[PDB]
């Protein structure tokens, strides 16, 4: 009785050219693109120093065929971009890498601000076997003991990323919530598929957010939001003294090979030896070592300069775009303030301070790198000068 | 709201003491005084004539 | 096959250039245009498929010398990559046809800028920080279209000729980090005035803070050192090594910071002698000022 229905089914499937006349696949594409949601959340904090402990899951569930047949190479590869972007906008801050395997929590890297140390360490986890049985209470209790040594003035948030396992609660994590709040720490949880309710309350009581990754493009957007510090305000974390302001030197006069270069053997900077060209030095100790914003070993504080260290945190502070205004008369100078030419296809963006018209290539660069408006230099300093 | 208020405070309190670091103000006033007095009006006409 | 681009930031200041001719100088404002006449031609000699972009720096705005903002080079671009509606001059680029038209736009655009300088508003100096804010918006618009097949390797050239004004120097640092994401190089060509903010653009991105001695010796330091090819600049070695070093100190304070602390929790770096607030409306506990004041 198969051919009795298979012969008549092919007659309908063969005449598939009649469905292309209707505008079904076309009308939905233009309506699904105009769906522009607007939920601007004020994610900003005045605290410049941040301490983070990224938790990486290493169970057997890191090999499922979701976004790609090898999930193990999906989290480790995309985490290198988060580390490089973290030091790009926040070089004075540092992160940490803590893995979890064989029902144990083995801390890989320490609390250092070396971008090369955290990137090269993730490539070694490729050969690491995935046994299974992840533990959340083990990777969270150890991170609090190390974070306790930091003075109370930072957000001291904790990031936890797992394979969205069905409730990764070892043995009643709700009893730990009353303890994590006393340490004034924060927990951030990122999901990948199934919902986790046992971690949603933890991200709300401590102070954070909870999101589930839906596509490969959504995982990159969520990491950008975590670059900015979490929006909060406390009273017991607002005391700090002695900030290190190093200076950049070259350790030469005319030629680099004619001089003993920098970061050699007899030099006090024996932390990262090799053959470099220059570095920083403490103004209160004259200790020359690597130029990476890391905690020195003669004072006990990280390096927060000003040119390309503390400015990166202030460069991300003005997070704002532009508005729009429709019209049915075709008017508005149509001359861009940055690239002169426009697009002339229903795209008029004005400013809320100087009112300047931009195109599709200038508005994207503002919310991504420019972070302000070029017209604020030829209008705001005008009356004050 | 507090972060939006602290942005206008730092951006405005510096205009009264701008370029006051080192020689960022001495070199700026040196070129202004070398040209001569500006409120005398007579010198302003010779500047645009050049 | 391959295209390039060079953004020249000319510090056309009628106040500084108007007083340099009194000191018996042969390189005045009339000779400053000749620098673009030579650099604009030597750039196209290596590759006839290049593009030219010159941005001025006036005391009121940053006028685009090439292409201009008028009805000739504003709406319609005279770039060599547009054969339609532009071919009486954009056809013989191999000599003095399109190269002369590129300099003619600068002379035509500067006509409206020189006449609009009545200096009746006392003195306002040149807004040098606003010049780099327009160069990033121009290199990003052309990169979105040329990102296919080609790559367009460009650079950023800055020619300093005067000091700054009452502008906030924080805006001059926003264009430095906004240019590092695109992996671009920023240069600096001072003439007489020296500033510590322009030198920061050469140390962060990896540029070169060159100091020009005499004025007529300008064609030598802009062709080999400031070459848009940037292929052999790592082993070139022509300008003298950098000896001085200028960075940044306090924001709203009259002191050189080196160990000082901010006001409270904001970003205004001040000093360590502050038990309470200063110029904000915050607070600070008395668990550290009693310790720092002692020693
Ligand atoms: Zn030290
Ligand atoms: Zn535009
Ligand atoms: Zn604006
Ligand atoms: Zn403050």
UniProtKB/Swiss-Prot annotation, chain A:
User: Predominant location of this chain?
Assistant: nucleus
**Keyword Plastid, does the record have it?**
no
Q: PROSITE patterns of this UniProt entry?
A: VWFA
Q: What is the effect of changing residue 336 to A?
A: No effect on the transcriptional activity of the reconstituted TFIIH complex
Residue positions, PTM Phosphotyrosine: 86
- Residue ranges of every copy of the VWFA domain listed in the record: 51-227
ZnF start-end (C4-type) = 282-299
Tell me which Gene Ontology terms the entry assigns under biological process: G protein-coupled receptor internalization; nucleotide-excision repair; regulation of transcription by RNA polymerase II; response to UV; transcription by RNA polymerase II; transcription initiation at RNA polymerase II promoter
Q: Which CDD domains match?
A: vWA_transcription_factor_IIH_type (cd01453)
Q: Mind telling me which GO cellular component terms the entry cites?
A: core TFIIH complex portion of holo TFIIH complex; nuclear speck; nucleoplasm; nucleus; transcription factor TFIID complex; transcription factor TFIIH core complex; transcription factor TFIIH holo complex
Give the matching Pfam families. C1_4, Ssl1
InterPro entries, A to Z: C1-like_sf, Ssl1-like, TFIIH_C1-like_dom, TFIIH_SSL1/p44, VWF_A, vWFA_dom_sf, Znf_C2H2_type, Znf_RING/FYVE/PHD
UniProt keywords, alphabetically = DNA damage, DNA repair, Host-virus interaction, Metal-binding, Nucleus, Phosphoprotein, Transcription, Transcription regulation, Zinc, Zinc-finger
Q: Which GO terms describe its molecular function?
A: RNA polymerase II general transcription initiation factor activity; zinc ion binding
Q: Outcome of residue 373 to A?
A: No effect on the transcriptional activity of the reconstituted TFIIH complex
As annotated in Swiss-Prot or TrEMBL, what is the tissue specificity of this protein?
Widely expressed, with higher expression in skeletal muscle.
- Compartments where found: Nucleus
Q: Does the keyword DNA repair apply?
A: yes
Q: Which family does it belong to?
A: Belongs to the GTF2H2 family.
In UniProt terms, what function does this protein have?
A: Component of the general transcription and DNA repair factor IIH (TFIIH) core complex, which is involved in general and transcription-coupled nucleotide excision repair (NER) of damaged DNA and, when complexed to CAK, in RNA transcription by RNA polymerase II. In NER, TFIIH acts by opening DNA around the lesion to allow the excision of the damaged oligonucleotide and its replacement by a new DNA fragment. In transcription, TFIIH has an essential role in transcription initiation.
Q: Which NCBIfam families match?
A: ssl1
Name by which UniProt lists this protein: General transcription factor IIH subunit 2
Species of origin reads: Homo sapiens (Human)
From Swiss-Prot, chain B:
Q: Would you say which domain of life the source belongs to?
A: Eukaryota
- What does the record say about PTM? (Microbial infection) Upon Rift valley fever virus infection, interacts with NSs leading to ubiquitination by the NSs-FBXO3 E3 ligase and proteasome-dependent degradation.
Residue positions where Phosphoserine is found in the record = 8
List the signal peptide residues. none
Localization, per the record, is: Nucleus
Described purpose of this protein according to its UniProt entry? Component of the general transcription and DNA repair factor IIH (TFIIH) core complex, which is involved in general and transcription-coupled nucleotide excision repair (NER) of damaged DNA and, when complexed to CAK, in RNA transcription by RNA polymerase II. In NER, TFIIH acts by opening DNA around the lesion to allow the excision of the damaged oligonucleotide and its replacement by a new DNA fragment. In transcription, TFIIH has an essential role in transcription initiation.
Indicate the family of this protein: Belongs to the TFB1 family.
Complex and partners: Component of the 7-subunit TFIIH core complex composed of XPB/ERCC3, XPD/ERCC2, GTF2H1, GTF2H2, GTF2H3, GTF2H4 and GTF2H5, which is active in NER. The core complex associates with the 3-subunit CDK-activating kinase (CAK) module composed of CCNH/cyclin H, CDK7 and MNAT1 to form the 10-subunit holoenzyme (holo-TFIIH) active in transcription. Interacts with PUF60.
Protein known as? General transcription factor IIH subunit 1
Record organism = Homo sapiens
Instruction: Specify first residue, last residue and whole-protein length for the fragment.
Output: 350 to 399 of 548
UniProtKB/Swiss-Prot annotation, chain C:
Q: For this UniProt entry, what is the primary localization, expressed as one broad class?
A: nucleus
A Gene Ontology biological process term: nucleotide-excision repair
* Family per similarity comment: Belongs to the TFB4 family.
- What InterPro entries does this protein map onto? TFIIH_Tfb4/GTF2H3, vWFA_dom_sf
Gene3D superfamilies the record matches: von Willebrand factor, type A domain
Q: How does it assemble?
A: Part of a TFIID-containing RNA polymerase II pre-initiation complex that is composed of TBP and at least GTF2A1, GTF2A2, GTF2E1, GTF2E2, GTF2F1, GTF2H2, GTF2H3, GTF2H4, GTF2H5, GTF2B, TCEA1, ERCC2, ERCC3, TAF1, TAF2, TAF3, TAF4, TAF5, TAF6, TAF7, TAF8, TAF9, TAF10, TAF11, TAF12 and TAF13. Component of the 7-subunit TFIIH core complex composed of XPB/ERCC3, XPD/ERCC2, GTF2H1, GTF2H2, GTF2H3, GTF2H4 and GTF2H5, which is active in NER.
Function text:
Component of the general transcription and DNA repair factor IIH (TFIIH) core complex, which is involved in general and transcription-coupled nucleotide excision repair (NER) of damaged DNA and, when complexed to CAK, in RNA transcription by RNA polymerase II. In NER, TFIIH acts by opening DNA around the lesion to allow the excision of the damaged oligonucleotide and its replacement by a new DNA fragment. In transcription, TFIIH has an essential role in transcription initiation.
UniProt keyword annotations, A-Z: DNA damage, DNA repair, Metal-binding, Nucleus, Transcription, Transcription regulation, Zinc, Zinc-finger
MF terms from GO for this chain are: RNA polymerase II general transcription initiation factor activity; zinc ion binding
Indicate yes or no for the key word ATP-binding: no
Protein's name according to its UniProt entry: General transcription factor IIH subunit 3
GO CC, sorted alphabetically, is:
core TFIIH complex portion of holo TFIIH complex; nucleoplasm; nucleus; transcription factor TFIID complex; transcription factor TFIIH core complex; transcription factor TFIIH holo complex; transcription preinitiation complex
Which intervals of the chain form a coiled coil? Answer: none
User: According to the UniProt entry, where is the signal peptide?
Assistant: none
Highest taxon above the source species:
Eukaryota
Question: Zn-finger regions (C4-type) at which positions?
Answer: 263-280
Metal-binding is among the record's keywords: yes
Q: Where in the cell is it found?
A: Nucleus
């Amino acid at each position: 009785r198969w051919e009795g229905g298979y012969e008549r089914t092919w007659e309908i499937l063969k005449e598939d050219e009649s469905g292309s006349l209707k505008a079904t696949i076309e009308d939905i594409l233009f309506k699904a693109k105009r769906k522009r949601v607007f939920e601007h959340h004020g994610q900003v904090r005045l605290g410049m120093m941040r301490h983070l402990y990224v938790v990486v899951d290493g169970s057997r569930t890191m090999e499922d065929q979701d976004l790609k047949p090898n999930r193990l190479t999906c989290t480790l590869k995309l985490l290198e971009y988060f580390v490089e972007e973290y030091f790009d906008q926040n070089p004075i801050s540092q992160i940490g890498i803590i893995v979890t395997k064989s029902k144990r929590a083995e801390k890989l890297t320490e609390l250092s601000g070396n971008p090369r140390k955290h990137i090269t360490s993730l490539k070694k986890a490729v050969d690491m076997t995935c046994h299974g049985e992840p533990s959340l209470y083990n990777s969270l209790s150890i991170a609090m003991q190390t974070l306790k040594h930091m003075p109370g003035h930072t957000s001291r948030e904790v990031l936890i990323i797992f394979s969205s396992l069905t409730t990764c609660d070892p043995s009643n994590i709700y009893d730990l919530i009353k303890t994590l709040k006393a340490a004034k720490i924060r927990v951030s949880v990122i999901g990948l598929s199934a919902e986790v309710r046992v971690c949603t309350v933890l991200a709300r009581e401590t102070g954070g957010t909870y999101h589930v990754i839906l596509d490969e493009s959504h995982y990159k957007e969520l990491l950008t939001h975590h670059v900015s510090p979490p929006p909060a305000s406390s009273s017991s974390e607002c005391s700090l003294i002695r900030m290190g302001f190093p200076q950049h030197t070259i350790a030469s006069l005319s030629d680099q090979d004619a001089k003993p270069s920098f970061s050699m053997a007899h030099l006090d900077g024996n932390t990262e030896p090799g053959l470099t060209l220059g570095g920083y030095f403490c103004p209160q100790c004259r200790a020359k070592y690597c130029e990476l914003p890391v905690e020195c070993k003669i004072c006990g504080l990280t390096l927060v300069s000003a040119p390309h260290l503390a400015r990166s945190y202030h460069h991300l502070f003005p997070l704002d775009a532009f508005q729009e205004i429709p019209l049915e008369e075709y008017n508005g100078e149509r001359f861009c303030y940055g690239c002169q030419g426009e697009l002339k296809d229903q795209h008029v963006y004005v400013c809320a301070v100087c009112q300047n018209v931009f195109c599709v290539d200038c508005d994207v660069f503002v919310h991504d790198s420019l972070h302000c408006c070029p017209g604020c230099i030829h209008k705001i300093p005008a009356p004050s000068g | 709201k507090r972060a939006k208020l602290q942005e206008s405070i730092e951006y405005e309190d510096l205009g009264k003491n701008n370029s006051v670091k080192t020689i960022a103000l001495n070199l700026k006033k040196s070129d202004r005084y070398y040209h001569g007095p500006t409120p005398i009006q007579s010198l302003q006409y010779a500047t645009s004539q050049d | 096959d391959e295209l390039n681009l060079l953004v020249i930031v000319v510090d056309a200041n009628p106040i500084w250039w108007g007083k340099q001719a009194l000191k018996e100088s042969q390189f005045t404002l009339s000779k400053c245009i000749d620098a673009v006449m030579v650099l604009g031609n030597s750039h196209l000699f290596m590759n006839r498929s290049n593009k030219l972009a010159v941005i001025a720096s006036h005391i009121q705005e940053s006028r685009f010398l090439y292409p201009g903002k008028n009805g000739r080079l504003g709406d319609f671009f005279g770039d060599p990559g547009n054969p339609p509606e532009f071919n009486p001059s954009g056809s013989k680029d191999g000599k003095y046809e399109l190269l002369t038209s590129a300099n003619e736009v600068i002379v035509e655009e500067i006509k409206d800028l020189m006449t609009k300088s009545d200096i009746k508003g006392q003195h306002t100096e040149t807004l040098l920080a606003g010049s780099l804010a327009k160069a990033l918006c121009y290199i990003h618009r052309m990169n979105k279209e040329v990102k296919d097949n080609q790559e367009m390797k460009s650079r950023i050239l800055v020619i300093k000729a005067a000091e700054d004004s009452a502008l906030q120097y924080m805006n001059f640092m926003n264009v430095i980090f906004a240019a590092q994401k695109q992996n671009i190089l920023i240069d600096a060509c001072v003439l007489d005035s020296d500033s510590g903010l322009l030198q920061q653009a050469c140390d962060i991105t990896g540029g070169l803070y060159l100091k020009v001695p005499q004025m007529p010796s300008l064609l030598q330091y802009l062709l080999w050192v400031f070459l848009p090819d940037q292929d052999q600049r790592s082993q070139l070695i022509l300008p003298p090594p950098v000896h001085v070093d200028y960075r940044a100190a306090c924001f709203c304070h009259r002191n050189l910071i080196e160990i000082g602390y901010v006001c409270s929790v904001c970003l205004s770096i001040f000093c360590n002698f502050s038990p309470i607030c200063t110029t904000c409306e915050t607070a600070f506990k008395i668990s550290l000022p009693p310790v720092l004041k002692a020693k």
